[PDB]
PDB file of C-alpha atoms in Angstrom:
ATOM      1  CA  UNK A  29       8.061 -46.744 -20.522  1.00  0.00           C
ATOM      2  CA  UNK A  30       6.312 -43.676 -19.194  1.00  0.00           C
ATOM      3  CA  UNK A  31       3.577 -41.167 -19.656  1.00  0.00           C
ATOM      4  CA  UNK A  32       4.573 -37.566 -20.343  1.00  0.00           C
ATOM      5  CA  UNK A  33       2.001 -34.923 -19.409  1.00  0.00           C
ATOM      6  CA  UNK A  34       1.972 -31.351 -18.149  1.00  0.00           C
ATOM      7  CA  UNK A  35       1.308 -31.318 -14.392  1.00  0.00           C
ATOM      8  CA  UNK A  36      -0.841 -28.211 -14.692  1.00  0.00           C
ATOM      9  CA  UNK A  37      -2.554 -26.443 -17.586  1.00  0.00           C
ATOM     10  CA  UNK A  38      -4.405 -23.135 -17.529  1.00  0.00           C
ATOM     11  CA  UNK A  39      -6.984 -22.961 -20.305  1.00  0.00           C
ATOM     12  CA  UNK A  40      -8.648 -19.805 -21.589  1.00  0.00           C
ATOM     13  CA  UNK A  41     -12.395 -19.725 -20.888  1.00  0.00           C
ATOM     14  CA  UNK A  42     -14.612 -20.062 -23.956  1.00  0.00           C
ATOM     15  CA  UNK A  43     -11.669 -21.196 -26.054  1.00  0.00           C
ATOM     16  CA  UNK A  44      -9.725 -24.364 -26.784  1.00  0.00           C
ATOM     17  CA  UNK A  45      -7.153 -25.951 -24.495  1.00  0.00           C
ATOM     18  CA  UNK A  46      -4.898 -28.925 -25.196  1.00  0.00           C
ATOM     19  CA  UNK A  47      -3.784 -31.460 -22.603  1.00  0.00           C
ATOM     20  CA  UNK A  48      -0.547 -33.020 -23.884  1.00  0.00           C
ATOM     21  CA  UNK A  49      -0.014 -36.743 -23.364  1.00  0.00           C
ATOM     22  CA  UNK A  50       2.667 -38.974 -24.869  1.00  0.00           C
ATOM     23  CA  UNK A  51       3.757 -42.520 -24.220  1.00  0.00           C
ATOM     24  CA  UNK A  52       7.563 -42.471 -24.384  1.00  0.00           C
ATOM     25  CA  UNK A  53       9.677 -43.845 -25.818  1.00  0.00           C
ATOM     26  CA  UNK A  54       8.610 -45.989 -28.785  1.00  0.00           C
ATOM     27  CA  UNK A  55       9.051 -49.565 -27.553  1.00  0.00           C
ATOM     28  CA  UNK A  56       9.017 -52.599 -29.869  1.00  0.00           C
ATOM     29  CA  UNK A  57       7.044 -55.461 -28.334  1.00  0.00           C
ATOM     30  CA  UNK A  58       4.861 -53.009 -26.432  1.00  0.00           C
ATOM     31  CA  UNK A  59       1.331 -52.567 -27.778  1.00  0.00           C
ATOM     32  CA  UNK A  60      -1.182 -49.824 -27.040  1.00  0.00           C
ATOM     33  CA  UNK A  61      -4.533 -51.607 -26.817  1.00  0.00           C
ATOM     34  CA  UNK A  62      -6.533 -48.555 -25.777  1.00  0.00           C
ATOM     35  CA  UNK A  63      -6.190 -44.939 -24.677  1.00  0.00           C
ATOM     36  CA  UNK A  64      -8.551 -43.345 -22.176  1.00  0.00           C
ATOM     37  CA  UNK A  65      -8.964 -39.921 -20.633  1.00  0.00           C
ATOM     38  CA  UNK A  66     -10.675 -39.904 -17.270  1.00  0.00           C
ATOM     39  CA  UNK A  67     -11.767 -37.354 -14.675  1.00  0.00           C
ATOM     40  CA  UNK A  68     -10.957 -39.293 -11.474  1.00  0.00           C
ATOM     41  CA  UNK A  69     -12.981 -36.922  -9.299  1.00  0.00           C
ATOM     42  CA  UNK A  70     -16.149 -37.251 -11.383  1.00  0.00           C
ATOM     43  CA  UNK A  71     -18.890 -39.811 -10.639  1.00  0.00           C
ATOM     44  CA  UNK A  72     -18.734 -43.060 -12.637  1.00  0.00           C
ATOM     45  CA  UNK A  73     -21.290 -41.781 -15.162  1.00  0.00           C
ATOM     46  CA  UNK A  74     -19.093 -38.807 -16.086  1.00  0.00           C
ATOM     47  CA  UNK A  75     -15.646 -40.302 -15.511  1.00  0.00           C
ATOM     48  CA  UNK A  76     -14.721 -41.603 -18.976  1.00  0.00           C
ATOM     49  CA  UNK A  77     -14.517 -38.437 -21.066  1.00  0.00           C
ATOM     50  CA  UNK A  78     -12.661 -39.940 -24.030  1.00  0.00           C
ATOM     51  CA  UNK A  79     -11.276 -43.219 -25.361  1.00  0.00           C
ATOM     52  CA  UNK A  80      -9.358 -44.270 -28.466  1.00  0.00           C
ATOM     53  CA  UNK A  81      -9.139 -47.721 -30.060  1.00  0.00           C
ATOM     54  CA  UNK A  82      -6.392 -48.615 -32.589  1.00  0.00           C
ATOM     55  CA  UNK A  83      -8.946 -49.902 -35.111  1.00  0.00           C
ATOM     56  CA  UNK A  84     -12.256 -48.337 -34.071  1.00  0.00           C
ATOM     57  CA  UNK A  85     -11.019 -44.803 -33.368  1.00  0.00           C
ATOM     58  CA  UNK A  86     -12.320 -42.252 -30.851  1.00  0.00           C
ATOM     59  CA  UNK A  87     -15.298 -42.258 -28.511  1.00  0.00           C
ATOM     60  CA  UNK A  88     -16.550 -39.883 -25.840  1.00  0.00           C
ATOM     61  CA  UNK A  89     -18.574 -41.964 -23.330  1.00  0.00           C
ATOM     62  CA  UNK A  90     -19.442 -39.243 -20.812  1.00  0.00           C
ATOM     63  CA  UNK A  91     -22.044 -36.632 -21.873  1.00  0.00           C
ATOM     64  CA  UNK A  92     -19.838 -34.067 -20.123  1.00  0.00           C
ATOM     65  CA  UNK A  93     -17.901 -32.484 -21.663  1.00  0.00           C
ATOM     66  CA  UNK A  94     -19.158 -34.788 -24.424  1.00  0.00           C
ATOM     67  CA  UNK A  95     -18.160 -35.474 -28.029  1.00  0.00           C
ATOM     68  CA  UNK A  96     -19.305 -31.970 -29.004  1.00  0.00           C
ATOM     69  CA  UNK A  97     -16.494 -30.315 -27.055  1.00  0.00           C
ATOM     70  CA  UNK A  98     -13.634 -32.806 -27.397  1.00  0.00           C
ATOM     71  CA  UNK A  99     -11.145 -34.060 -29.973  1.00  0.00           C
ATOM     72  CA  UNK A 100      -7.976 -36.130 -30.151  1.00  0.00           C
ATOM     73  CA  UNK A 101      -5.272 -33.878 -31.565  1.00  0.00           C
ATOM     74  CA  UNK A 102      -3.018 -36.598 -32.997  1.00  0.00           C
ATOM     75  CA  UNK A 103      -4.384 -40.100 -32.331  1.00  0.00           C
ATOM     76  CA  UNK A 104      -5.410 -41.881 -35.548  1.00  0.00           C
ATOM     77  CA  UNK A 105      -7.104 -45.217 -36.227  1.00  0.00           C
ATOM     78  CA  UNK A 106      -5.498 -47.731 -38.565  1.00  0.00           C
ATOM     79  CA  UNK A 107      -6.841 -47.663 -42.122  1.00  0.00           C
ATOM     80  CA  UNK A 108      -6.397 -49.071 -45.614  1.00  0.00           C
ATOM     81  CA  UNK A 109      -4.064 -51.957 -46.366  1.00  0.00           C
ATOM     82  CA  UNK A 110      -0.939 -50.681 -44.630  1.00  0.00           C
ATOM     83  CA  UNK A 111      -1.640 -47.530 -42.575  1.00  0.00           C
ATOM     84  CA  UNK A 112      -1.095 -48.428 -38.908  1.00  0.00           C
ATOM     85  CA  UNK A 113      -2.733 -46.820 -35.870  1.00  0.00           C
ATOM     86  CA  UNK A 114      -0.929 -44.041 -33.999  1.00  0.00           C
ATOM     87  CA  UNK A 115      -1.920 -43.712 -30.340  1.00  0.00           C
ATOM     88  CA  UNK A 116       1.411 -42.720 -28.786  1.00  0.00           C
ATOM     89  CA  UNK A 117       0.371 -39.057 -28.847  1.00  0.00           C
ATOM     90  CA  UNK A 118      -2.907 -39.084 -26.918  1.00  0.00           C
ATOM     91  CA  UNK A 119      -3.149 -35.301 -26.554  1.00  0.00           C
ATOM     92  CA  UNK A 120      -6.727 -34.205 -25.866  1.00  0.00           C
ATOM     93  CA  UNK A 121      -8.320 -30.905 -26.855  1.00  0.00           C
ATOM     94  CA  UNK A 122     -11.279 -29.368 -25.029  1.00  0.00           C
ATOM     95  CA  UNK A 123     -13.332 -26.751 -26.862  1.00  0.00           C
ATOM     96  CA  UNK A 124     -15.600 -23.976 -25.601  1.00  0.00           C
ATOM     97  CA  UNK A 125     -13.911 -24.245 -22.201  1.00  0.00           C
ATOM     98  CA  UNK A 126     -16.085 -23.744 -19.137  1.00  0.00           C
ATOM     99  CA  UNK A 127     -15.470 -23.658 -15.377  1.00  0.00           C
ATOM    100  CA  UNK A 128     -17.269 -27.011 -15.146  1.00  0.00           C
ATOM    101  CA  UNK A 129     -14.348 -28.484 -17.107  1.00  0.00           C
ATOM    102  CA  UNK A 130     -11.902 -27.652 -14.311  1.00  0.00           C
ATOM    103  CA  UNK A 131     -10.245 -30.482 -12.417  1.00  0.00           C
ATOM    104  CA  UNK A 132      -7.944 -33.476 -12.692  1.00  0.00           C
ATOM    105  CA  UNK A 133      -7.594 -35.356 -15.976  1.00  0.00           C
ATOM    106  CA  UNK A 134      -5.846 -38.703 -16.260  1.00  0.00           C
ATOM    107  CA  UNK A 135      -4.366 -39.944 -19.526  1.00  0.00           C
ATOM    108  CA  UNK A 136      -4.129 -43.737 -19.532  1.00  0.00           C
ATOM    109  CA  UNK A 137      -2.506 -46.154 -21.943  1.00  0.00           C
ATOM    110  CA  UNK A 138      -3.817 -49.696 -21.603  1.00  0.00           C
ATOM    111  CA  UNK A 139      -0.759 -51.570 -22.840  1.00  0.00           C
ATOM    112  CA  UNK A 140       0.398 -55.148 -23.270  1.00  0.00           C
ATOM    113  CA  UNK A 141       2.306 -56.698 -21.733  1.00  0.00           C
ATOM    114  CA  UNK A 142       3.075 -53.843 -19.304  1.00  0.00           C
ATOM    115  CA  UNK A 143      -0.533 -53.082 -18.356  1.00  0.00           C
ATOM    116  CA  UNK A 144      -2.023 -49.693 -17.516  1.00  0.00           C
ATOM    117  CA  UNK A 145       0.242 -46.638 -17.393  1.00  0.00           C
ATOM    118  CA  UNK A 146      -1.037 -43.146 -16.637  1.00  0.00           C
ATOM    119  CA  UNK A 147      -0.235 -39.470 -16.211  1.00  0.00           C
ATOM    120  CA  UNK A 148      -2.370 -36.813 -14.529  1.00  0.00           C
ATOM    121  CA  UNK A 149      -2.907 -33.152 -15.393  1.00  0.00           C
ATOM    122  CA  UNK A 150      -4.745 -30.475 -13.432  1.00  0.00           C
ATOM    123  CA  UNK A 151      -6.783 -28.290 -15.771  1.00  0.00           C
ATOM    124  CA  UNK A 152      -7.696 -24.890 -14.366  1.00  0.00           C
ATOM    125  CA  UNK A 153      -9.096 -21.677 -15.747  1.00  0.00           C
TER     126      UNK A 153
ATOM    127  CA  UNK B  24     -25.471 -48.092 -25.539  1.00  0.00           C
ATOM    128  CA  UNK B  25     -26.107 -49.479 -22.052  1.00  0.00           C
ATOM    129  CA  UNK B  26     -23.382 -48.832 -19.473  1.00  0.00           C
ATOM    130  CA  UNK B  27     -21.293 -51.575 -17.889  1.00  0.00           C
ATOM    131  CA  UNK B  28     -20.053 -52.233 -14.371  1.00  0.00           C
ATOM    132  CA  UNK B  29     -17.417 -54.399 -12.695  1.00  0.00           C
ATOM    133  CA  UNK B  30     -18.606 -57.110 -10.324  1.00  0.00           C
ATOM    134  CA  UNK B  31     -16.165 -57.924  -7.519  1.00  0.00           C
ATOM    135  CA  UNK B  32     -16.225 -58.713  -3.802  1.00  0.00           C
ATOM    136  CA  UNK B  33     -15.422 -55.892  -1.351  1.00  0.00           C
ATOM    137  CA  UNK B  34     -13.315 -58.299   0.678  1.00  0.00           C
ATOM    138  CA  UNK B  35     -11.755 -61.721   0.139  1.00  0.00           C
ATOM    139  CA  UNK B  36     -10.097 -63.867   2.806  1.00  0.00           C
ATOM    140  CA  UNK B  37      -7.378 -66.304   1.839  1.00  0.00           C
ATOM    141  CA  UNK B  38      -5.585 -69.088   3.688  1.00  0.00           C
ATOM    142  CA  UNK B  39      -1.817 -68.779   4.158  1.00  0.00           C
ATOM    143  CA  UNK B  40       0.085 -71.054   1.783  1.00  0.00           C
ATOM    144  CA  UNK B  41      -3.163 -71.843  -0.001  1.00  0.00           C
ATOM    145  CA  UNK B  42      -4.893 -70.621  -3.149  1.00  0.00           C
ATOM    146  CA  UNK B  43      -7.593 -67.956  -3.319  1.00  0.00           C
ATOM    147  CA  UNK B  44      -9.625 -66.466  -6.161  1.00  0.00           C
ATOM    148  CA  UNK B  45     -10.418 -62.783  -6.593  1.00  0.00           C
ATOM    149  CA  UNK B  46     -13.748 -62.784  -8.470  1.00  0.00           C
ATOM    150  CA  UNK B  47     -14.166 -60.211 -11.229  1.00  0.00           C
ATOM    151  CA  UNK B  48     -16.407 -59.920 -14.274  1.00  0.00           C
ATOM    152  CA  UNK B  49     -18.022 -57.284 -16.464  1.00  0.00           C
ATOM    153  CA  UNK B  50     -21.807 -56.885 -16.605  1.00  0.00           C
ATOM    154  CA  UNK B  51     -23.920 -56.861 -18.595  1.00  0.00           C
ATOM    155  CA  UNK B  52     -23.073 -58.285 -22.015  1.00  0.00           C
ATOM    156  CA  UNK B  53     -23.579 -55.318 -24.345  1.00  0.00           C
ATOM    157  CA  UNK B  54     -23.886 -55.405 -28.150  1.00  0.00           C
ATOM    158  CA  UNK B  55     -21.010 -53.494 -29.739  1.00  0.00           C
ATOM    159  CA  UNK B  56     -19.010 -53.305 -26.520  1.00  0.00           C
ATOM    160  CA  UNK B  57     -15.473 -54.658 -26.827  1.00  0.00           C
ATOM    161  CA  UNK B  58     -13.057 -55.651 -24.073  1.00  0.00           C
ATOM    162  CA  UNK B  59      -9.656 -54.512 -25.329  1.00  0.00           C
ATOM    163  CA  UNK B  60      -7.645 -55.360 -22.222  1.00  0.00           C
ATOM    164  CA  UNK B  61      -8.017 -56.635 -18.675  1.00  0.00           C
ATOM    165  CA  UNK B  62      -5.628 -55.607 -15.898  1.00  0.00           C
ATOM    166  CA  UNK B  63      -5.156 -56.233 -12.190  1.00  0.00           C
ATOM    167  CA  UNK B  64      -3.314 -53.633 -10.137  1.00  0.00           C
ATOM    168  CA  UNK B  65      -2.154 -53.183  -6.538  1.00  0.00           C
ATOM    169  CA  UNK B  66      -2.748 -49.409  -6.196  1.00  0.00           C
ATOM    170  CA  UNK B  67      -0.876 -49.177  -2.881  1.00  0.00           C
ATOM    171  CA  UNK B  68       2.243 -50.984  -4.092  1.00  0.00           C
ATOM    172  CA  UNK B  69       5.407 -49.242  -5.334  1.00  0.00           C
ATOM    173  CA  UNK B  70       5.283 -48.014  -8.947  1.00  0.00           C
ATOM    174  CA  UNK B  71       7.327 -50.922 -10.312  1.00  0.00           C
ATOM    175  CA  UNK B  72       5.126 -53.470  -8.528  1.00  0.00           C
ATOM    176  CA  UNK B  73       1.662 -52.104  -9.337  1.00  0.00           C
ATOM    177  CA  UNK B  74       0.697 -53.943 -12.536  1.00  0.00           C
ATOM    178  CA  UNK B  75       0.439 -57.551 -11.356  1.00  0.00           C
ATOM    179  CA  UNK B  76      -1.611 -59.064 -14.187  1.00  0.00           C
ATOM    180  CA  UNK B  77      -2.892 -58.256 -17.670  1.00  0.00           C
ATOM    181  CA  UNK B  78      -4.832 -60.185 -20.302  1.00  0.00           C
ATOM    182  CA  UNK B  79      -4.972 -59.374 -24.011  1.00  0.00           C
ATOM    183  CA  UNK B  80      -7.699 -60.882 -26.247  1.00  0.00           C
ATOM    184  CA  UNK B  81      -5.158 -62.160 -28.781  1.00  0.00           C
ATOM    185  CA  UNK B  82      -1.864 -62.252 -26.876  1.00  0.00           C
ATOM    186  CA  UNK B  83      -3.036 -63.747 -23.583  1.00  0.00           C
ATOM    187  CA  UNK B  84      -1.777 -63.209 -20.013  1.00  0.00           C
ATOM    188  CA  UNK B  85       1.159 -61.224 -18.663  1.00  0.00           C
ATOM    189  CA  UNK B  86       2.321 -60.566 -15.106  1.00  0.00           C
ATOM    190  CA  UNK B  87       4.589 -57.466 -15.130  1.00  0.00           C
ATOM    191  CA  UNK B  88       5.113 -57.134 -11.363  1.00  0.00           C
ATOM    192  CA  UNK B  89       7.328 -59.433  -9.237  1.00  0.00           C
ATOM    193  CA  UNK B  90       4.824 -59.390  -6.364  1.00  0.00           C
ATOM    194  CA  UNK B  91       2.990 -61.694  -6.298  1.00  0.00           C
ATOM    195  CA  UNK B  92       4.518 -62.622  -9.666  1.00  0.00           C
ATOM    196  CA  UNK B  93       3.852 -64.916 -12.621  1.00  0.00           C
ATOM    197  CA  UNK B  94       4.721 -68.059 -10.654  1.00  0.00           C
ATOM    198  CA  UNK B  95       1.883 -67.468  -8.186  1.00  0.00           C
ATOM    199  CA  UNK B  96      -0.734 -65.864 -10.434  1.00  0.00           C
ATOM    200  CA  UNK B  97      -3.163 -67.150 -13.051  1.00  0.00           C
ATOM    201  CA  UNK B  98      -6.365 -66.084 -14.787  1.00  0.00           C
ATOM    202  CA  UNK B  99      -9.025 -68.632 -13.863  1.00  0.00           C
ATOM    203  CA  UNK B 100     -11.292 -68.354 -16.912  1.00  0.00           C
ATOM    204  CA  UNK B 101      -9.841 -65.758 -19.304  1.00  0.00           C
ATOM    205  CA  UNK B 102      -9.284 -67.163 -22.810  1.00  0.00           C
ATOM    206  CA  UNK B 103      -7.298 -65.755 -25.737  1.00  0.00           C
ATOM    207  CA  UNK B 104      -8.345 -66.242 -29.366  1.00  0.00           C
ATOM    208  CA  UNK B 105     -13.147 -66.196 -29.988  1.00  0.00           C
ATOM    209  CA  UNK B 106     -11.529 -64.517 -26.977  1.00  0.00           C
ATOM    210  CA  UNK B 107     -13.336 -64.578 -23.626  1.00  0.00           C
ATOM    211  CA  UNK B 108     -12.374 -61.761 -21.252  1.00  0.00           C
ATOM    212  CA  UNK B 109     -15.702 -61.107 -19.505  1.00  0.00           C
ATOM    213  CA  UNK B 110     -14.522 -63.168 -16.521  1.00  0.00           C
ATOM    214  CA  UNK B 111     -11.295 -61.614 -15.237  1.00  0.00           C
ATOM    215  CA  UNK B 112     -11.161 -63.687 -12.040  1.00  0.00           C
ATOM    216  CA  UNK B 113      -7.613 -63.955 -10.714  1.00  0.00           C
ATOM    217  CA  UNK B 114      -6.121 -66.761  -8.626  1.00  0.00           C
ATOM    218  CA  UNK B 115      -3.268 -66.303  -6.144  1.00  0.00           C
ATOM    219  CA  UNK B 116      -1.195 -69.359  -5.266  1.00  0.00           C
ATOM    220  CA  UNK B 117       1.150 -69.943  -2.329  1.00  0.00           C
ATOM    221  CA  UNK B 118      -0.531 -67.135  -0.416  1.00  0.00           C
ATOM    222  CA  UNK B 119       1.823 -65.071   1.755  1.00  0.00           C
ATOM    223  CA  UNK B 120       1.288 -62.140   4.117  1.00  0.00           C
ATOM    224  CA  UNK B 121       2.866 -59.866   1.537  1.00  0.00           C
ATOM    225  CA  UNK B 122      -0.014 -60.658  -0.795  1.00  0.00           C
ATOM    226  CA  UNK B 123      -2.296 -58.729   1.498  1.00  0.00           C
ATOM    227  CA  UNK B 124      -3.942 -55.489   0.402  1.00  0.00           C
ATOM    228  CA  UNK B 125      -5.954 -53.816  -2.340  1.00  0.00           C
ATOM    229  CA  UNK B 126      -6.405 -55.366  -5.777  1.00  0.00           C
ATOM    230  CA  UNK B 127      -8.097 -53.465  -8.598  1.00  0.00           C
ATOM    231  CA  UNK B 128      -9.723 -55.232 -11.535  1.00  0.00           C
ATOM    232  CA  UNK B 129     -10.010 -53.084 -14.649  1.00  0.00           C
ATOM    233  CA  UNK B 130     -11.638 -53.580 -18.040  1.00  0.00           C
ATOM    234  CA  UNK B 131     -10.368 -51.326 -20.819  1.00  0.00           C
ATOM    235  CA  UNK B 132     -13.392 -51.292 -23.114  1.00  0.00           C
ATOM    236  CA  UNK B 133     -14.502 -49.612 -26.315  1.00  0.00           C
ATOM    237  CA  UNK B 134     -16.461 -47.525 -26.693  1.00  0.00           C
ATOM    238  CA  UNK B 135     -17.239 -47.168 -22.958  1.00  0.00           C
ATOM    239  CA  UNK B 136     -13.660 -46.713 -21.739  1.00  0.00           C
ATOM    240  CA  UNK B 137     -12.081 -47.988 -18.527  1.00  0.00           C
ATOM    241  CA  UNK B 138     -14.155 -49.456 -15.692  1.00  0.00           C
ATOM    242  CA  UNK B 139     -12.939 -50.946 -12.436  1.00  0.00           C
ATOM    243  CA  UNK B 140     -13.721 -52.610  -9.112  1.00  0.00           C
ATOM    244  CA  UNK B 141     -11.512 -52.969  -6.049  1.00  0.00           C
ATOM    245  CA  UNK B 142     -11.171 -55.880  -3.633  1.00  0.00           C
ATOM    246  CA  UNK B 143      -9.326 -56.077  -0.321  1.00  0.00           C
ATOM    247  CA  UNK B 144      -7.482 -59.372   0.130  1.00  0.00           C
ATOM    248  CA  UNK B 145      -7.052 -60.447   3.761  1.00  0.00           C
ATOM    249  CA  UNK B 146      -4.613 -63.100   4.797  1.00  0.00           C
TER     250      UNK B 146
END
């Protein structure tokens, strides 16, 4: 029913920083169709920094920061006969932090039937 | 993989009490690019009234917000399952002055992520 994030996170330059994001609480009848992380203040070509699909897993559309410097801490694709996807914890990790990484990050859950729900975090160094 | 963009009109003018369409579709068709969800939002509306329409490939349409609401909203060409979500065009019926304002059409895609276009509806 909402998106829990930290309003502000100070990362340590050159290291790894995590941006927490959780869709709370677990709601039956509510489906997470996709998760995206966006930098709203970046141009369109650099805006979508990460996405996660229940079946197809993670992607990192923008070259910056790019797949090389990003990972989903807890999100997992569905697999096997019975193992279901877990996207409720969409926490993102940035690695080799640089000043270029500074700015607003938006964590969005594209859900049905409720639609898009988001939380925003300011990452600073 | 080639990038995608949302095609919409900057401004649409509707007739009071009449019906009007808000054109929206994703271009171009890209191999391996999946539309996971379509949503329409009114970004200037109160939190509870922002998500006005959504379309899921398998589960179909939903209209979370009361304004305009399910009774006055419909997806013109969107089809649930092969599913067809490329055309997210929305139709407003029984147009009122309260329907005025910004409408944002968003495609939640994989692997490209979320892409949008905004249209101002005049009444």
